[PDB]
């Protein structure tokens, strides 16, 4: 059906701009209107700028709190629609989603605005010393997010991962994946981690002691 | 602005019974038209928002009709009737009646299950991360209900709270259980100091914790 694709997120430091994008498919994209709804654990879902169509003169509008700061803007050649977001603030930290009102999201796209420097994950299996319980450890990477797989997303059911921690502007987090006892080390688990941000992909073995 | 008014959370609702979230809203949106533009957006955890209903109690495609919506231009109530693991997340109420948008604070739909012993497991650090020098220690609490619990961590016996640090999941979608995992960072220097680890998991299933060791 409707699919709607965001990308160009990433980190950029204090004062510094940023510009994202998204692409649907699925509908005819110069039909419909378009906005940027960011969400963040402080202020929860806001909408932030929308446009309207080309008979409208491609109108634009802004929420009070980044009118200067953002412009919203549309290729309905290529069926695009982007943010250019300038001066920005760490408050400007959020998950940023294209949002055709009011009936279809996109998947988001994370825009960090931190001093700090982008870091790779170190990633660590667990491994034991009728089910077997085994896991990844992602350790000391900046900014959020990473995403961890096990298989290649083959093993989906008996998985969790667990929310990152941060310590001394660095991440943490584990994944867990629990499979029958027979299965491990007799096939493979492996863990895929992937870190936008520094461009790290990632896979681990878990290997028996 | 419009300001949508609801409660962070709902009392847990057990499996198979009725939840109940309300919305208010500052305005009424309740248009000349007939049609009353609140909606109603369900985020499941790891997920995007997606829409359940529009205009006040319309189900949007796919939506299951144990959903339904009622409401008048300025106070309205979301209905599941028979809730089931799948539904937990957070429901948004918003309007469409101006810009600009806004959005409730969302409320976070809480299941009631059968209380569950965690299942624990303890993994020394690899070797990998022993040559990169250092040595985190992790324990899984997994898939446990109800939320709270407690790890403690013993290191020859001693107990240990420095360099912990615990991190909890969303209720899961499929059992409506609750995992956590404890993470004890040690520098390689220190974790050659010592031999045996313990992580001790008190949850209300049991008076006595479930312990998991190894020895270095
Ligand atoms: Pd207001």
């Known amino acids: 059906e409707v699919k709607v694709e965001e990308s160009g997120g990433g980190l950029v430091q204090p004062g510094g701009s940023m510009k994202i994008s998204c692409v649907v498919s699925?509908?005819?994209?110069?039909?419909?209107?378009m906005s940027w709804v960011r969400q963040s654990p402080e202020k929860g879902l806001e909408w932030v700028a929308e446009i309207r169509l080309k008979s409208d003169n491609y109108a634009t509008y802004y929420a009070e709190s980044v009118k200067g700061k953002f412009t919203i803007s549309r290729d309905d050649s290529k069926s695009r629609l982007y943010l250019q977001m300038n001066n920005l603030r760490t408050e400007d930290t959020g998950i940023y989603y294209c949002?055709?009102?009011?009936?279809?999201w996109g998947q988001g796209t994370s825009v960090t605005v931190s001093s700090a420097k982008t870091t790779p994950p170190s990633v660590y299996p667990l491994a034991p010393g009728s089910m077997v319980t085994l896991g990844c450890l992602v350790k000391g990477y900046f900014p959020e997010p990473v995403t961890v797989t096990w298989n290649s997303g083959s093993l989906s059911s008996g998985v969790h991962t667990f929310p990152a921690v941060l310590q001394s502007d660095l991440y943490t987090l584990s994944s867990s994946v629990t499979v029958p006892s027979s299965t491990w080390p007799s096939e493979t688990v492996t863990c895929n981690v992937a870190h936008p941000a520094s461009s790290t992909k990632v896979d681990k073995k878990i290997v028996p002691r | 602005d419009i300001v949508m008014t609801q409660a962070a959370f709902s009392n847990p609702v057990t499996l198979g019974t009725s939840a109940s979230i309300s919305c208010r809203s500052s305005?009424?949106?309740?248009?000349?038209?007939?049609?009353?533009?609140l909606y109603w957006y369900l985020q499941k955890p790891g997920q995007s928002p997606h829409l359940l209903i529009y205009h006040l109690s319309n189900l949007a495609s796919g939506v299951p009709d144990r959903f339904s919506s009622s409401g008048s231009g300025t106070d309205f109530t979301l209905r599941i009737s028979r809730v089931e693991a799948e539904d937990v997340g957070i429901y948004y109420c918003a309007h469409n009646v101006e810009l600009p948008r806004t959005f409730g604070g969302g409320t976070k739909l809480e299941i009631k299950r059968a209380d569950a012993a965690p299942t624990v497991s303890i993994f020394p650090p690899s070797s990998e991360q022993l040559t990169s020098g250092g040595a985190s220690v992790v324990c899984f609490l997994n898939n446990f209900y109800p939320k709270d619990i407690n790890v403690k961590w013993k290191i020859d016996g001693s107990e240990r709270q420095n360099g912990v640090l615990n991190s909890w999941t969303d209720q899961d979608s499929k059992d409506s259980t609750y995992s956590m995992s404890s993470t004890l960072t040690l520098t390689k220097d220190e974790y050659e100091r010592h031999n045996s680890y313990t992580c001790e998991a008190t949850h209300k299933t049991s008076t006595s914790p479930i312990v998991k060791s190894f020895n270095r």
């Open positions: 699925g509908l005819t994209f110069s039909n419909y209107w």
């Open positions: 949002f055709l009102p009011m009936d279809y």
């Open positions: 305005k009424s949106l309740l248009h000349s038209d007939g049609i009353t533009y």
